[PDB]
UniProtKB/Swiss-Prot annotation, chain C:
Known function: Component of the anaphase promoting complex/cyclosome (APC/C), a cell cycle-regulated E3 ubiquitin-protein ligase complex that controls progression through mitosis and the G1 phase of the cell cycle. The APC/C is thought to confer substrate specificity and, in the presence of ubiquitin-conjugating E2 enzymes, it catalyzes the formation of protein-ubiquitin conjugates that are subsequently degraded by the 26S proteasome.
Compartments where located: Nucleus
Family the entry assigns: Belongs to the CDC26 family.
Known partners and oligomeric status: The APC/C is composed of at least 13 subunits that stay tightly associated throughout the cell cycle: APC1, APC2, APC4, APC5, APC9, APC11, CDC16, CDC23, CDC26, CDC27, DOC1, MND2 and SWM1. CDC26 is required to tether the essential subunits APC9, CDC27 and CDC16 to the complex.
Organism: Saccharomyces cerevisiae (strain ATCC 204508 / S288c) (Baker's yeast)
UniProt name for this protein: Anaphase-promoting complex subunit CDC26
Modification Phosphoserine, positions: S12
Domain of life: Eukaryota
Swiss-Prot record, chain D:
Gene: CDC23
GO MF term list: cyclin binding
Annotated consequence of substituting S58F: In CDC23-52; G2/M cell cycle arrest at 37 degrees Celsius
Part of the whole protein covered: 6 to 501 of 626
Function: Component of the anaphase promoting complex/cyclosome (APC/C), a cell cycle-regulated E3 ubiquitin-protein ligase complex that controls progression through mitosis and the G1 phase of the cell cycle. The APC/C is thought to confer substrate specificity and, in the presence of ubiquitin-conjugating E2 enzymes, it catalyzes the formation of protein-ubiquitin conjugates that are subsequently degraded by the 26S proteasome.
Subunit details: The APC/C is composed of at least 13 subunits that stay tightly associated throughout the cell cycle: APC1, APC2, APC4, APC5, APC9, APC11, CDC16, CDC23, CDC26, CDC27, DOC1, MND2 and SWM1. CDC23 interacts directly with SWM1 and binds the destruction box (D-box) of the substrate cyclin CLB2.
Protein name per Swiss-Prot or TrEMBL: Anaphase-promoting complex subunit CDC23
PTM note: Phosphorylated by CDC28, which is required for the early mitotic activity of the APC/C in its CDC20-bound form.
Subcellular location(s) per record: Nucleus; Chromosome, Centromere, Kinetochore
TPR repeats: 145-178, 225-258, 259-292, 293-326, 327-360, 361-394, 395-428
Consequence when changing G37D: In CDC23-54; G2/M cell cycle arrest at 37 degrees Celsius
The UniProt record lists the keyword Transcription: no
Coiled coil: none
UniProtKB/Swiss-Prot annotation, chain F:
Functional note: Component of the anaphase promoting complex/cyclosome (APC/C), a cell cycle-regulated E3 ubiquitin-protein ligase complex that controls progression through mitosis and the G1 phase of the cell cycle. The APC/C is thought to confer substrate specificity and, in the presence of ubiquitin-conjugating E2 enzymes, it catalyzes the formation of protein-ubiquitin conjugates that are subsequently degraded by the 26S proteasome.
Naturally occurring in which organism (per UniProt): Saccharomyces cerevisiae (strain ATCC 204508 / S288c)
Annotated family: Belongs to the APC5 family.
Additional facts recorded: Present with 259 molecules/cell in log phase SD medium.
Location(s), subcellular: Nucleus
Subunit structure of this chain's protein: The APC/C is composed of at least 13 subunits that stay tightly associated throughout the cell cycle: APC1, APC2, APC4, APC5, APC9, APC11, CDC16, CDC23, CDC26, CDC27, DOC1, MND2 and SWM1. APC5 directly interacts with MND2 and SWM1.
Name by which UniProt lists this protein: Anaphase-promoting complex subunit 5
Curated annotation (Swiss-Prot), chain G:
Quaternary assembly: The APC/C is composed of at least 13 subunits that stay tightly associated throughout the cell cycle: APC1, APC2, APC4, APC5, APC9, APC11, CDC16, CDC23, CDC26, CDC27, DOC1, MND2 and SWM1. SWM1 interacts directly with CDC23 and APC5, and is required to tether APC9, CDC16, CDC26 and CDC27 to the complex.
Disulfide linkage: none
Protein's name according to its UniProt entry: Anaphase-promoting complex subunit SWM1
Residue intervals passing through the bilayer: none
Recorded family membership: Belongs to the APC13 family.
Positions spanned in the full protein: 2 to 114 of 170
Origin species: Saccharomyces cerevisiae (strain ATCC 204508 / S288c) (Baker's yeast)
Protein's job: Component of the anaphase promoting complex/cyclosome (APC/C), a cell cycle-regulated E3 ubiquitin-protein ligase complex that controls progression through mitosis and the G1 phase of the cell cycle. The APC/C is thought to confer substrate specificity and, in the presence of ubiquitin-conjugating E2 enzymes, it catalyzes the formation of protein-ubiquitin conjugates that are subsequently degraded by the 26S proteasome.
Length: 185, 48, 35, 431, 123, 326, 81, 125
């Protein structure tokens, strides 16, 4: 009885979970989300985004230049956007540009770490904090969209790679609280 | 102790002629049934 | 039970050489008419 | 203009999203980029029990797990969800489909074959034959065009160019404003007299499906990218131009600050051997879009002739700074080594860039030239041959064989190679 | 049976039996060394019969069915060389030599094509 | 002057500093001869191999009969303080200052490499006396500077374009570190820098068209901070070869065992190794082991001692197990 | 020109990491076939007997006895040992 | 054990793609069973390069040196494993044995002692 009602709840949500996450070009959770729905027990498309037609044109430019491996070019065109949904895409493009570049820089280097166990990365962190304060929600509110929750995920992961533990955990909890069902988070 | 710079220097010296030495032996063009390894062999015999 | 490739034959050497010789005949006689 | 530019905006918004939706990165990138230069309509035929497979198929493709997509869509009867599986099944074959002789030069290591696509072509033919609605009449939709397009490119693999043209033009009739479709149509010409014959076919025999397209787009001459078709054909091979100048001007008034037009317009100057004007046109593009890297190797090629090594070194530094593993970047760096008379190392970077696309612009030929200065005369002639097989329209590829065979004692082979290049570019005084 | 009557240089009953064989097997055996072999043999019989016209088309359809084959390309070059279409046969010869290394008869045919091209003075 | 530390098999920014000085000395156009004491302090640490067993032997041959100055850290601040001391050392220091300002690009770096190999370096003395038409001093391969420059040239033709890109990124990072220092402010304007800089910048072949956008390629790459900088992989602040690092640590442990040294600078850089250099340079572990004994730490010393004997034994083909136990 | 706009083949963006092209030789590696090539490791005619013995182990005792020296001639006449 | 099945898996998995971290560890195992060590040692280094997080391949690469009668090379391979993460019982045990194979019995006592703390509830250790 109630289990079937739960079953009825999960496919729609997982339809939503795989929609936006794939729509925002992060595959850590999008690949897992469709996998989860495929194995779900047997018992119109859903889409929505608060974007204006003027700025929605930049999304197609931003989204298609993302998977075309030209992350740097995406940042240049999407520099002046102010919407939180797109602001994540620019910094995500910015973050993955560094991650891909770092992989090319070291291939002969097998061991990874620091023997005792930044500035370029710290540049990314400031736009997050600067944009977060300017935006008129700043979490802890009922009217909190997926994009702001998704923004906190990038803030958490960029904090962890700087070894700033015990602050990324709180950021991750805030992101999961506003939006669960994000495996990469 | 094996010098990492010295060993990798010899590696570069080995691979460098290998690009120039590509065409020797196996490679065969169309229209010519004899490779260029013995083009210079008979050319050496030509003057000598 | 398995069938191998059925017998097929291609251009032999004799017929192709005969065609080569013929090609030389009609590439030899016409320039005499031109000259 | 007036409503004409407005009608373009809405329909181009479509061609940007569904093409990106059904994993056609190349076509969607041009269309989406065209929105920026230009001064959420959603809809598809799918069911809830089948909609999950698209999400399942799309997100695994993005994660680059190509082969698993084929298995998970083993039995799909959707008109165009079948396309994603066969498209993924095609690339899964292609990555392991490297010809042995090209591979030796491709790597230098010096160390089921094709029946898969034979099944792929049969699979497409069986599906279309048993499909409910054919291409005739006002039936069919956006998805059916992709199947014919996928069918056409597979036909080109077996050198079935004659049927390849029929398939591609059939696909374009059902759905237009697909850029990746026209690129494959370019390689099908390999001749000059057929272009005007195909031009006659577009003007008289060809017709558009107005049902899918918007207003003022079913007509061939109000269409905007049919001008793009005419621009591309008359720059790869000049021949005899028809309305080339007049139609170029109209497309320039529309699409302001569109980088692709300026790069193509500037590339025309290089083809006209006007080097001084070409650099100025190239330079403005760099200022506007520093992070655009496409057709930057032409910029390196022009600088090579002027031998402005100081500027070229900085050009190589700027391109390599932001990305180090794109085909044009390694090509530009490799071109730099030619300026330093280090022809022996320029091979390595051309070798690296070639493995990136293995269907590039005239980078095979530039690979061949560096061997000539080394006096191999046997790697170059085989290397020159590969450029002929891929693009038989390349002047430099044919000329390379003839020049190299000129050094060889047997000059008999040089006549045929020079004759083909003679037809391609009769205007050259040297040939 | 067709190859038998082709060996004895009859060139007539071989063609008849081979056409009967293909018309029996028009519907089935689309690939897999049966339609290719039968069609190649019929084209080969036609070349021996000097009826080169139907031979060009049959070799062409065999070629579009399967591209990687040196024998089909060599025979098509031979057919073109029978007529005067050297521009469209030399490419076939070069590709045939590309597919298979030696092809001695193909090398001879290609060389003769070079002397033909040298002699001729087409615009 | 601090920064992340990393072992490099390529041209360190330090190596070019010696290359800058040797160019001025050999060119003999400015009449500036670098003092022999300056060269012996810079090149000599780079000379290969000293070796040092952990124990069983104390300063058997490491001790120098004549007291030697400490090896110099790879910071432009430390190198200048050597030249700056002389009353006329401002002339020598400015010569290095002008050259480091003249080299604004990788092609310019290639200009220095080409000049030395074609003209300066000479195979043997038998061709020295037949080269009396040279306006610049020439050097033999077997000489002290000759054998050094040969290794530096060999170390330049060994890498690809990836190697040269890392060369120019770090030097500008190395150069701009000195810009935000009090010493640079004292040398903000010196008029002689412009004179020496213009000596080599001449024959640029363009001053009207290319230089507007020549500046653009550098400025866009550099961190103008007007917009978000172009994203690039994290780059090390200092690059040192194995041999140079060997000389600093050997001097440090000998000095610790029983011209001013920088204990703080050496220790901080050595703590930022990427854990792969330590494998290629096992002596970093024992530098902790000597330190561990100082505070009389039992567990800490043993792990370092065991660590040093795991990496050293494998690199050396000879059996060294019989030395580890004792 | 137009290079990255065509998408009809395996391209540089279809594989996940663009820097995997640096190695680009693992595709051209012939993996050792299952059974008989294991015999060449010991050696660094014998391999075929080994494979023959391995497949010969699947007999009954009496069946093996019958086939112990069994030889079959071309015309069908049979020799039993 | 069952080399025929492993040979089947190795041929089948390599056919999909050779760029995953796993696909380069399955084959090496198949190559290790055939006493072909100079080749199996190659795949473990390959399997680690694709993804450096797979530290389990370090101990296996160390083992593959021991069978090669090369104790010096083995010591580093095991030693890197503990430097990635000190709480590796496999790495300590594999490093302890390499000294135990040689006559340096007491010099291996510390390594065995360290491995004791990881899994005290084991008869083997």
């Amino acid at each position: 009885d109630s289990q079937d009602k739960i079953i009825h709840d999960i496919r729609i949500q997982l339809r939503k979970a795989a929609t936006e996450l794939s729509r925002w070009k992060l595959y850590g959770s999008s690949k897992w989300a469709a996998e989860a729905l495929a194995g779900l027990a047997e018992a119109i498309p859903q889409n929505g985004f608060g974007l204006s037609e003027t700025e929605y044109d930049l999304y197609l430019l931003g989204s298609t230049l993302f998977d075309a491996k030209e992350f740097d070019r995406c940042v240049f065109f999407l520099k002046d956007v102010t919407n939180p949904y797109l602001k994540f895409l620019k910094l995500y493009s910015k973050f993955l540009s560094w991650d891909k570049k770092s992989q090319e820089s070291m291939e002969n280097i097998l061991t990874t770490g620091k023997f005792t166990d930044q500035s370029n990365i710290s540049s990314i962190l400031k736009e997050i904090n600067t944009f977060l304060e300017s935006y008129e929600i700043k979490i802890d509110d009922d009217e909190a969209d997926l994009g702001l929750a998704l923004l906190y995920y990038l803030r958490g992961v960029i904090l962890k790679q700087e070894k700033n533990i015990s602050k990324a955990m709180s950021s991750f909890l805030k992101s999961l609280s506003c939006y669960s069902f994000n495996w990469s988070c | 102790k094996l010098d990492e710079f010295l060993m990798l220097s010899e590696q570069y010296k080995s691979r460098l002629p290998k690009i120039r030495k590509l065409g020797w032996n196996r490679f065969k063009p169309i229209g010519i049934n004899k490779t260029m390894y013995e083009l210079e062999m008979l050319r050496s015999r030509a003057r000598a | 039970m398995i069938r191998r490739a059925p017998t097929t034959l291609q251009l032999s050497h004799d017929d192709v050489t005969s065609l080569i010789d013929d090609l030389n005949e009609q590439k030899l006689k016409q320039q005499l008419n031109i000259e | 203009q007036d409503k004409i530019i407005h009608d373009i905006r809405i329909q181009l918004r479509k061609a940007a999203t569904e093409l990106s939706r059904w994993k056609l990165y190349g076509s969607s990138k041009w269309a989406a980029e065209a929105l920026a230069g230009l001064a959420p309509q959603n809809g598809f035929g799918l069911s809830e029990t089948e909609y999950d497979l698209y999400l399942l198929g799309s997100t695994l493709f993005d994660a680059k797990e190509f082969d698993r997509c084929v298995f998970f869509l083993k039995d799909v009867t959707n008109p165009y969800l079948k396309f994603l599986k066969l498209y993924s099944k095609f690339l899964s074959w292609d990555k392991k489909s490297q010809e042995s002789m090209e591979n030796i030069l491709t790597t230098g290591k010096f160390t089921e074959s094709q029946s898969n696509i034979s099944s792929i072509l049969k699979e497409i033919n069986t599906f279309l034959e048993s499909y409910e609605i054919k291409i005739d009449d006002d039936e069919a939709d956006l998805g059916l065009a992709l199947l014919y397009y996928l069918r056409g490119v597979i036909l080109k693999q077996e050198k079935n160019i004659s049927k390849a043209m029929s398939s591609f033009l059939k696909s374009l009739s059902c759905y237009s404003f697909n850029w990746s479709c026209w690129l494959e149509l370019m390689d099908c010409l390999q001749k000059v007299d057929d272009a005007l014959l195909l031009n006659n076919y577009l003007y008289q025999n060809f017709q558009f499906k107005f049902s899918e397209n918007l207003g003022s787009q079913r007509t061939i001459e109000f269409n905007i990218m049919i001008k793009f078709f005419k621009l591309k054909v008359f720059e790869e091979l000049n021949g005899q131009l028809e309305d080339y100048f007049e139609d170029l001007e109209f497309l320039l008034q529309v699409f302001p600050n569109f980088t692709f037009l300026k790069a193509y317009n500037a590339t025309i100057s290089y083809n006209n051997l006007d080097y001084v004007t070409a650099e100025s046109r190239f330079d403005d593009i760099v200022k506007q879009d520093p992070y655009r890297l496409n057709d930057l190797e032409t910029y390196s090629n022009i600088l090579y002739v002027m031998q402005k090594n100081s500027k070229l070194a900085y050009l190589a530094q700027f391109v390599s700074q932001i990305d180090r593993f794109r085909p044009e970047t390694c090509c530009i760096i490799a071109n730099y080594y030619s300026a330093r008379q280090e022809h022996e190392k320029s091979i390595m970077y051309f070798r690296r860039a070639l493995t990136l696309d293995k269907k590039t612009t005239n980078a095979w030929t530039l690979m061949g030239h560096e061997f000539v200065e080394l006096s191999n005369s046997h790697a170059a002639i085989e290397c020159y041959r590969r450029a002929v097989d891929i693009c038989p329209r390349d002047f430099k590829a044919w000329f390379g064989l003839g020049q190299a065979y000129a050094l060889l004692d047997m000059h008999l082979y040089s006549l045929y190679y020079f004759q083909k290049a003679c037809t391609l570019k009769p205007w050259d005084r040297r040939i | 049976m067709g190859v038998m009557y082709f060996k004895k240089n009859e060139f007539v009953k071989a063609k008849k039996y081979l056409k009967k064989a293909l018309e029996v097997v028009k519907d089935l055996d689309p690939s897999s060394r049966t339609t290719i072999s039968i069609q190649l043999n019929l084209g080969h019989t036609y070349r021996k019969l000097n009826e080169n016209e139907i031979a060009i088309k049959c070799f062409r359809c065999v070629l579009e069915k399967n591209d990687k084959n040196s024998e089909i390309h060599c025979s098509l070059g031979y057919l073109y060389l029978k007529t005067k279409k050297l521009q469209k046969a030399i490419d076939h010869l070069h590709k045939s030599l590309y597919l298979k290394p030696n092809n001695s008869s193909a090398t001879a045919l290609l060389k003769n094509a070079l002397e033909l091209n040298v002699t001729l003075s087409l615009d | 002057k601090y920064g992340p530390l990393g072992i490099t098999n390529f041209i360190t920014p330090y190596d070019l500093c010696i290359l800058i000085l040797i160019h001025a000395h050999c060119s003999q156009d400015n009449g500036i001869s670098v003092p022999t004491a300056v060269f012996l302090r810079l090149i000599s640490p780079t000379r290969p191999s000293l070796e040092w067993n952990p124990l069983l032997k104390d300063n058997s041959n490491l001790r120098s009969s004549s007291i030697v100055p400490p090896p110099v850290l790879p910071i432009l601040d430390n190198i200048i303080r050597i030249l700056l001391d002389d009353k006329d050392g401002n002339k020598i220091a400015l010569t290095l200052m002008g050259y480091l300002e003249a080299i604004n690009g990788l092609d310019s770096i290639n200009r220095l490499m080409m000049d030395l190999e074609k003209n300066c370096l000479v195979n043997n003395y038998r061709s020295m006396k037949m080269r009396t038409t040279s306006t610049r001093r020439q050097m033999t391969r077997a000489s002290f500077l000759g054998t050094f420059l040969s290794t530096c040239i060999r170390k330049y033709q060994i890498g690809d374009f990836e190697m040269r890109e890392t060369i120019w990124i770090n030097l500008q990072n190395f150069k701009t570190v000195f810009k935000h220092t009090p010493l640079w402010l004292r040398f903000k304007d010196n008029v002689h820098i412009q004179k020496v800089k213009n000596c080599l910048l001449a024959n640029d072949e363009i001053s009207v068209e290319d230089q507007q956008m020549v500046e653009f390629f550098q400025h866009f790459n550099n961190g103008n901070d007007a917009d978000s900088k172009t994203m690039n992989e994290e780059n090390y602040g200092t690059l040192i070869s194995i041999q140079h690092l060997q000389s600093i640590v050997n001097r440090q442990i000998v000095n610790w065992l029983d011209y001013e040294e920088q204990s703080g600078l050496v220790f901080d850089l050595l703590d930022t190794l990427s854990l792969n250099d330590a494998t290629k340079f096992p002596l970093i572990f024992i530098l902790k082991y000597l330190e561990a004994i100082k505070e009389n730490s039992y567990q800490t010393a043993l792990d370092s001692l065991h660590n040093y004997f795991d990496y050293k034994s494998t690199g050396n083909s000879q059996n060294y197990f019989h030395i580890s136990l004792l | 020109s137009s290079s990255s706009y065509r998408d009809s083949y395996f391209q540089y963006r279809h594989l996940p990491a663009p820097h995997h092209i640096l190695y680009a030789e693992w595709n051209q590696d012939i993996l050792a076939l299952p059974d008989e090539v294991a015999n060449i490791t010991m050696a660094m005619m014998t391999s075929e007997q080994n494979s023959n013995r391995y497949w010969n182990s699947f007999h009954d005792e009496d069946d093996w006895n019958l086939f112990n020296g069994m030889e079959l001639e071309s015309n069908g006449v049979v020799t039993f040992a």
